[PDB]
Design a protein around this ligand. Structure first.
Ligand SMILES: [Mg+2]
Ligand SMILES: [Mg+2]
Ligand SMILES: [Mg+2]
Ligand SMILES: [Mg+2]
Ligand SMILES: [Mg+2]
Ligand SMILES: [Mg+2]
Ligand SMILES: [Mg+2]
Ligand SMILES: [Mg+2]
Ligand SMILES: [Mg+2]
Ligand SMILES: [Mg+2]
Ligand SMILES: [Mg+2]
Ligand SMILES: [Mg+2]
Ligand SMILES: [Mg+2]
Ligand SMILES: [Mg+2]
Ligand SMILES: [Mg+2]
Ligand SMILES: [Mg+2]
Ligand SMILES: [Mg+2]
Lengths: 258, 227, 945
RNA sequence: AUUCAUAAUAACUUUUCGAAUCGCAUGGCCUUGUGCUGGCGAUGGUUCAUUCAAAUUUCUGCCCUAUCAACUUUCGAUGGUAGGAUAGUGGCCUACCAUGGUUUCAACGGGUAACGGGGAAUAAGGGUUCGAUUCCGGAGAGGGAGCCUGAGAAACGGCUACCA
RNA sequence: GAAACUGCGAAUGGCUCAUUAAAUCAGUUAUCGUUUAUUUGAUAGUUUACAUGGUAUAACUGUGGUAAUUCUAGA
């Protein structure tokens, strides 16, 4: 190619969007934004294919141009705005607030939240560095640059960002016994407690996570997101509480509830 | 060859066909920007001075300044040059153009009357063509009317009458770079925004300094305890 | 913005401003014919809408309201029993002022009133107070849809409680006074419409009580709110009026004409009438028109005589005369008003009648119309007449106003002779009023004023003013005016050898009195001090034109050969009219002399006549260039040369850029005719801005004549015509000030534009050699630093200075000028200027001196001035032991230049990073210089201190 | 893990940037001035970070051919030094230096009806064959060569030569 | 609101498999070795002003050349 691509075939689109393979030939390409392409849910798919509010792309554009959709407390109008992990989607007319969280199956789940819990978000500190004029700043997983951080905040910590002011309200250190959420890999969507961090200089760090059912799994450190202390999450978790269930047990539960 | 003579002070312009070759020969060997005497061309042009501006040959190709030849040549023309209008950004095209030396094979020669002779040409000197459009920018209006700074350009805008059937009205330009309260409001708003941002940054810096000082004092106290 | 979205774009979605939505919004629920949910009902209106709004609105606040009230609204008996809690919750939730729940709540509040309306009456006061606070809150958060909900909620309540509110409207109005009186126009406009619907539903008896109350209140924005209220009640559909309009309109009139009602109420009625008159067509107004005539006829009385006339004035003016069905009726009223007041109001009335009346009716009444004016408006008939002329002068002339004016003058010339003079003065310029000037004037007044000059004392400006206003009337005198004038002019000339501005105008008036030789001799004896005045110049123009050439004249002008050349000095004046009249005077004098008028004179007259427009912009330039060529080729005498050169500089005074083009092209090629004459003309123009020119004119004794001529009207159209009439009255109220004020207006223009110096400088630039030869006269400005002047009164502009310095460089031999050395030092001062452009001009003139050493290093100095090459030149040109360094022998001449040029660069504001390094470089080169030169550089810095 | 982030000192610059832009609306202070102050947005702009990307890049893996056994090095092949160029590392190129680099564990040369892969067929299993072709990546626009523009092109429904 | 200037896009998409045998490509690394329009978040009291020029032109008016082209010359 001679430049950046602007099209996305349906088959090449991220699996977890759950797009029909025969509805069309192309899929929404998320525009550049806070989140990466493969780890983002564009607003069109959220409003049309998940909430079923809009029947087709044109109605989604009609919704957005009315300025009813807010992402992280700011109005967005791009149909392909890449909403992602820990972003708050507010629809005032419906009096609805959503937080985008992966369910156990690894897909973004429609999770309804109260307004108070919608007042803030959580961000993984991706970088801590001194800016120009000797001003420290922190860059989070969603690309927010926050100046004058608390000095104790280090990389891989979690910061609770208030959306109204864009400032850090509190922070959680990455330590053993903390509650964490998996945001990548085959263990995507699971929740557990840290047990031990293996360090490999010049390589990818590994973290052992024990679930509430005492099952253990190892995951690369880049895919871990600290969300609180054990039993005291700082956000409301989706149904299932991040517990992975075997196929047989899922069958049993499904038959029972039916 | 035909002579397209233009009088810029009137803004007038007219074509004269030529048959006798004495005048045509005195045009020969000249160059764009050079001046020739009209009396040599003919009695009707006695006392006139003609500056050569360009021409077209029997094949229609134009004459280009800067190329000193009597024959056509294929030149690579680019943005902001005569004889070529680029269709696409950065497009450069090689086109045939006629040289800047007058020759026998010019179909038409363009002339500008630098100085008027004793006799008045019927179609050029005796007639006038008005300017199509008047000044638009405020300073241009002041310059045209020689207004003082205090005098408002608003009252000196040229108006043109348009009549449609039985109805009639006037049209006038939108002045640009006019001092209006909206512009003052915008300027003031920018200045206030700038000052407020500066003050907020200073406040944040002071708060961070206090936090760092408190942490430092606590750490030093702990170190003293360890000792 | 005026040009509204009248032409609609093809776009489906388009932005609309909050103001735009408010403007098109209108509070009138009945018009909306869309199906309403509550129209279909099973239990109650409240329940039907309540279930629907549960479905549509999902707002949090409305949801909580629904849960609290869901159980108590299932059946109509349930609603009635629990009404107290229902109303409390509705008011409680509405108070939060949440938009997302406001719509269901406001609707349910209306439907709540629908279910239990008579029972709502105990809730009625609380509801309106809740709505008023909501609307007042809505002003802060701009949402047009909120206002639509609230006012419709108000309208619906107003619809359902129509019978009971109609009984106590003044109470209901009292609640809405804050809305009707509110500062924002739209809130008053909306509240007026909602309240208006009750007004239409009134019994007539109840309405009269309501109309009395509001008029009592009337004695901020209440006037405007009431005006919208009543006019809205009158209008129902386009070009039609409501059936009840006649009943309401009668009630308003009867209260308005009542003595108890305040006068502003009648003003309101006038405004109400005009709104409906404009809105409605002819047929719809006929029932309304009839009631107005009958009521006026029935209630005519001395006490209400003024009020009735005020309304009639509105009727005749309203939409001119087209809405009026039959003017015979209005005429039949007018004598009844006349037979049974305020003169100014009457004058206002008849003038519109003349303008607006159909031809037939005016003819029947034109004679009786003006006889009334002589009856009672005779105190101010002329104020009426001038207003009548301005409205329709042709109709007045067609209908024999002129003879009635002639009759008027005979009756009252003794009383208000000055006021007559003001009228004939103002109408003089108007060509359409030539018939008025033709009106013969009463003879007895002429003799009485004629006797005045025959024995008049003229020793002070006040006596001159007595002559002046009298002098205007003699122009129509036919009793051999010339004989009386000549002794008076001699008295005036001898008494005031040095005229002031007022005197010059009087003599012009006096010369104007003349109609078809001794007088010509009189003016020639004393004219040098009056050539400047336009009015004198016109009066002289009238005299010479009337008089026929003869041999005796040729003797007369021969006695004063300098007459022609003296008048030529008027062509440098800033006024076009003065120049034109002077030219016309010049031609006539030559005819009297018998001398041939040069063709150049005729051509210049044509140019002055051409209008100054873009269309004619080019044509002007060629005429200047053609006549300039005509002047150049043709050899002429001094008078022609003096005429043309002065006329050219007169064109420079013109404020038309194309005109400047021709003269700037013409002048450089014709100045050889008179090198001395052009130079003085250029020299004078340079000194004009410094020269102080003031117009001092006689101030007449102040007249404290002013009064509220007419009433004030809200509507712009009527208010404008009132302003025009009042302006006329005030003008005639102070006749002394008005006469002088009119006079100063027509004198002309004597203040040269402040840019005239720049124009002269351009002439100087085009011809450097003349400036070089006459440097003696231009030298002092430079040594003053171009400052009038230790505090400075004024200085030249930077543009003027720049053109001057450029001219100096153009001098072929600057070294041999009158004062080369003193000039040479001052240019060194300019070479030290901070402005780099000034230094280049200063250097160029310095290089104009032929000095070999400077010529050797000229380019290096120029590069030092150039900003781009300043830095490298410092290293190469000035480094000690440098190859390109100044030789030791040549240092002494060059270093003073080098020291001064660097000084200005140190004065650059050391503000930007490139500009800061520039200052460091300037100071860093000092060590290269020898210590004596460093001492010189330090000396320059302290010289200003 | 750094000459990292950042800061400071002395200078330098055909040297930048630091709002001369636009819509809607008319609030607040008064010494009442078309005085002062002021809201909601659009579009621009230095630097940092993020995102879509781009470039180069480490390790391992390709069918037939030994009746192709030596190849590369003069005209860069291996490496050092310094410079030029590049967005940047680098024989990428230049100047001076050394004589290096790969190979029977198959280099080099030749054939390929050779775009590579996810995949498709058969088979009990090992294997054998196919994959221009719905997705990913690469290259091309008749064949070579060379460029303007622009963040992004050696573009071809952009341009210039030559060949046909 | 035509035309034109200005900004943006036209380097995406679509087609084909000619060349290409450690080349492409697959998996896996690195940029402490570099550019990055745009989006997102930060970020600039230190720079006649009730606001500067043509150091300028398009569209447009008007006069024209060529057999011809998304050709264009003078004013
Ligand atoms: Mg690493
Ligand atoms: Mg363009
Ligand atoms: Mg228009
Ligand atoms: Mg070499
Ligand atoms: Mg190197
Ligand atoms: Mg092939
Ligand atoms: Mg194959
Ligand atoms: Mg394939
Ligand atoms: Mg290509
Ligand atoms: Mg082909
Ligand atoms: Mg190509
Ligand atoms: Mg293409
Ligand atoms: Mg091969
Ligand atoms: Mg490889
Ligand atoms: Mg863009
Ligand atoms: Mg940005
Ligand atoms: Mg031109």
């Amino acid at each position: 190619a001679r430049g950046p691509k602007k099209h996305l075939k349906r088959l090449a689109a991220p699996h977890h969007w759950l797009l029909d393979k025969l509805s069309g030939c192309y899929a929404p390409r998320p525009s550049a934004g806070p989140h990466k392409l493969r780890e983002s849910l564009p607003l069109i798919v959220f409003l049309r294919n998940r909430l079923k509010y809009a029947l087709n792309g044109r109605e989604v554009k009609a919704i957005l141009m009315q300025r009813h959709v807010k992402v992280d407390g700011k109005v967005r109008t791009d149909t392909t705005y890449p909403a992602g992990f820990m972003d708050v989607i507010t629809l005032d007319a419906t009096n609805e607030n959503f937080r985008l969280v992966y369910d156990v199956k690894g897909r973004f789940a429609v999770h309804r939240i109260t307004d108070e819990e919608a007042s803030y978000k959580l961000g993984k500190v991706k970088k801590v560095q001194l800016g120009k004029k000797g001003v420290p700043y922190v860059v989070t997983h969603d690309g927010r640059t926050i100046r004058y951080p608390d000095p104790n905040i280090k990389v891989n910590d979690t910061v609770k960002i208030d959306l109204a002011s864009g400032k850090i309200t509190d922070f959680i250190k990455f330590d053993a016994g903390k509650l964490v959420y998996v945001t990548g890999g085959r263990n995507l969507g699971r929740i557990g407690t840290i047990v031990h961090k293996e360090r490999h200089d010049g390589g990818f760090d590994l973290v052992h996570i024990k679930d509430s059912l005492d099952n253990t799994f190892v995951t690369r450190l880049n895919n871990v997101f600290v969300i609180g202390e054990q039993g005291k999450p700082y956000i409301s978790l989706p149904k299932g509480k991040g517990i992975k269930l075997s196929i047989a047990e899922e069958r049993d539960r499904r038959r029972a509830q039916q | 060859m035909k002579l397209n003579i233009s009088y810029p002070v009137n803004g007038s312009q007219k074509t004269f066909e030529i048959d006798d070759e004495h005048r045509i020969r005195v045009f020969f060997d000249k160059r764009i920007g050079q001046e020739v005497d009209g009396e040599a061309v003919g009695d009707e042009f006695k006392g006139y001075v003609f500056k050569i501006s360009g021409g077209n040959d029997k094949q229609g190709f134009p004459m280009k300044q800067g190329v000193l030849l009597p024959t056509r040549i294929k030149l690579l023309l680019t943005k902001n040059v005569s004889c070529y209008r680029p269709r696409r950004d950065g497009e450069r095209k090689r086109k045939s153009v006629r040289g800047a030396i007058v020759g026998p094979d010019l179909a038409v020669l363009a002339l500008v009357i630098v100085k008027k002779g004793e006799q008045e040409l019927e179609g050029l000197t005796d007639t006038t063509v008005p300017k199509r459009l008047g000044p638009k920018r405020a300073n241009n209006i002041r310059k045209f009317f020689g207004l003082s700074k205090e005098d408002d350009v608003r009252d000196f805008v040229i108006r043109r009458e348009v009549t449609k059937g039985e109805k009639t009205y006037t049209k006038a330009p939108k002045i640009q770079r006019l001092v209006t309260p909206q512009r003052l409001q915008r300027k003031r708003h920018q200045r206030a925004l700038k000052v407020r941002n500066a003050q907020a940054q200073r406040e944040a810096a002071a708060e961070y300094a206090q936090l760092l000082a408190k942490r430092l004092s606590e750490r030093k106290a702990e170190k003293a305890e360890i000792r | 913005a005026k040009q509204r979205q009248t032409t609609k774009s093809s776009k489906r979605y388009r932005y609309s401003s909050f103001k735009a939505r408010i403007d098109d919004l209108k509070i009138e629920p009945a018009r909306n014919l869309e199906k309403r949910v509550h129209d279909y009902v099973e239990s109650s209106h409240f329940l039907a809408s309540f279930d629907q709004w549960k479905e549509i609105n999902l707002s949090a606040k409305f949801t909580e309201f629904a849960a609290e009230i869901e159980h108590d609204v299932q059946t109509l008996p349930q609603i009635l029993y629990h009404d107290k809690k229902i109303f409390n919750s509705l008011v409680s939730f509405i108070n939060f002022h949440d938009e997302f729940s406001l719509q269901p709540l406001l609707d349910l509040l209306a439907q709540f009133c629908h279910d239990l309306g008579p029972d709502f009456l105990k809730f009625y006061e609380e509801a309106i107070k809740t709505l008023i606070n909501l609307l007042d809150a809505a002003i802060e958060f701009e949402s047009s849809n909120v206002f639509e909900w609230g006012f419709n909620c108000l309208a619906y309540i107003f619809k359902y409680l129509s019978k009971f509110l109609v009984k106590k409207l003044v109470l209901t109005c009292d609640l809405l006074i804050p809305l009707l009186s509110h500062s924002k126009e739209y809130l008053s406009r909306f509240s007026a419409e909602a309240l208006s619907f009750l007004v239409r539903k009134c019994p007539v008896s109840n309405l009269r009580e309501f109309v009395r109350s509001v008029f009592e209140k009337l004695e901020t924005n209440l006037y405007e709110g009431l005006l919208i209220l009543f006019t809205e009640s009158m209008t129902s559909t386009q070009e039609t009026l409501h059936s009840k309009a006649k009943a309401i309109m009668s009630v308003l009139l009867h209260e308005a004409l009542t003595k108890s009602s305040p006068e502003r109420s009648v003003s309101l009625l006038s405004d109400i009438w005009m709104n409906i008159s404009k809105y409605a067509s002819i047929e719809s107004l006929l029932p309304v028109y009839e009631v107005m005539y009958q009521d006026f006829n029935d209630s005519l009385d001395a006490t209400n005589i003024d009020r009735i006339l005020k309304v009639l004035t509105t009727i005749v003016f309203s939409e001119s005369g087209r809405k009026i069905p039959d003017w015979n009726k209005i005429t039949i009223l007018i004598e009844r008003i006349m037979s049974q007041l305020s003169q100014d109001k009457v004058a206002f009335l008849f003038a519109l009648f003349i303008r607006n009346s159909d031809v037939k009716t005016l003819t029947l009444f034109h004679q009786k119309l003006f006889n009334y004016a002589l009856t009672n408006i005779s105190d101010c008939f002329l104020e009426f007449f001038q207003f009548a002329l301005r409205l329709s002068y042709e109709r007045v002339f067609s209908f024999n106003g002129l003879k009635f004016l002639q009759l008027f003058l005979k009756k009252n010339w003794q009383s208000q002779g000055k006021k007559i003079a003001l009228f004939f003065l103002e109408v003089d310029d108007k060509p359409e009023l030539q018939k008025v000037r033709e009106v013969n004037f009463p003879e007895e007044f002429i003799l009485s004023i004629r006797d005045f000059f025959v024995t008049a004392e003229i020793n002070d400006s006040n006596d001159l003013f007595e002559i002046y206003w009298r002098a205007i009337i003699f122009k129509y005198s036919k009793l051999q005016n010339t004989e009386i004038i000549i002794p008076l002019l001699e008295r005036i000339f001898s008494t005031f050898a040095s005229p002031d501005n007022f005197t010059k105008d009087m003599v012009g008036t006096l010369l104007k009195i003349y109609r078809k030789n001794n007088l010509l001799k009189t003016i020639l004896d004393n004219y040098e001090n009056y050539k400047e005045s336009l009015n004198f110049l016109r009066g002289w123009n009238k005299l010479v034109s009337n008089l026929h050439p003869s041999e005796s004249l040729k003797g007369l002008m021969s006695h004063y050969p300098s007459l022609l050349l003296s008048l030529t000095d008027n062509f440098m004046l800033p006024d076009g009219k003065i120049r034109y009249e002077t030219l016309e005077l010049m031609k006539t004098l030559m005819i009297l002399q018998g001398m041939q008028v040069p063709d150049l004179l005729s051509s210049c007259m044509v140019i002055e006549e051409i209008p100054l427009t873009l269309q004619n912009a080019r044509d002007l330039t060629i005429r200047i260039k053609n006549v300039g060529a005509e002047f150049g080729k043709t050899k002429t005498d001094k008078l022609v040369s003096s005429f043309f050169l002065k006329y050219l500089f007169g064109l420079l005074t013109v404020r038309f850029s194309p005109v400047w083009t021709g003269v700037f092209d013409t002048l450089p090629n014709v100045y050889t005719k008179d090198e001395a004459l052009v130079w003085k003309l250029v020299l004078s123009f340079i000194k004009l801005p410094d020269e102080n020119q003031n117009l001092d004119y006689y101030q007449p004794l102040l007249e404290d004549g002013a009064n509220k001529v007419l009433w004030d009207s809200s509507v712009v159209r009527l208010r404008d015509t009132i302003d025009t009439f009042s302006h006329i009255w005030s003008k005639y109220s102070t006749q002394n000030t008005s006469i002088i004020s009119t006079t100063i207006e027509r004198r002309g223009n004597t203040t040269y534009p402040i840019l005239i110096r720049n124009q002269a400088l351009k002439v100087m630039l085009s011809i450097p050699q003349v400036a070089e030869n006459h440097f003696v006269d231009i030298a002092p400005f430079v040594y003053n630093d171009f400052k009038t002047y230790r505090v400075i009164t004024g200085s030249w502009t930077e543009v003027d200075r720049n053109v001057f310095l450029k001219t100096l460089s153009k001098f072929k031999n600057i070294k041999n000028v009158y004062s080369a050395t003193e000039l040479h030092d001052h240019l060194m001062v300019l070479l030290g200027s901070r402005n780099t452009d000034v230094q280049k001009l200063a250097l160029d003139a310095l290089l104009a001196y032929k000095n070999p050493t400077l010529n050797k290093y000229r380019d290096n100095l120029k590069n030092l001035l150039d900003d781009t090459l300043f830095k490298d030149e410092i290293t190469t040109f000035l480094t000690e032991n440098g190859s390109q360094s100044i030789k030791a022998e040549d240092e002494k001449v060059v270093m003073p230049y080098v020291l001064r040029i660097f000084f200005g660069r140190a004065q650059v504001p050391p503000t930007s990073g490139q500009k800061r390094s520039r200052k460091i470089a300037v100071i860093s080169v000092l060590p290269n210089f020898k210590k004596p030169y460093i001492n010189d550089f330090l000396s320059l810095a302290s010289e200003r201190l």
